[PDB]
């Protein structure tokens, strides 16, 4: 079943009739992670390539 987020923000001085709206939100995060970089050093057509 559908469970929607609650904000209790709107309906402030307005007439509401459509209960067919479900509120979904996108969540963004930024993290510091350890990643391994591989340096392909084929000399032909440029060598230093990480």
């Amino acid at each position: 079943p559908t469970s929607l987020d609650v904000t209790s923000m709107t309906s402030w001085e307005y007439n509401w009739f459509g209960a067919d709206v479900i509120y979904i939100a996108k969540y963004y995060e930024v993290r510091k992670e350890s990643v391994d970089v591989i340096s392909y050093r084929h000399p032909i057509t440029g060598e230093i390539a990480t």
Binding site: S8, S11, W16, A19
Partner: protein
Amino acid sequence: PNNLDSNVSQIVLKKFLPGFMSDLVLAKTVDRQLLAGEINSSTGDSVSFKRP
């Protein structure tokens, strides 16, 4: 005999043991959009809705 109990101190750590807790099902299931923003303390103490 060595009496050196004044060389130490009684310590109460800054740690809190876990407590008890309940759950919320009744509040989430009810209808809250109808009554939200419809009652004001100064205006009155009752609201009415129309039957079909």
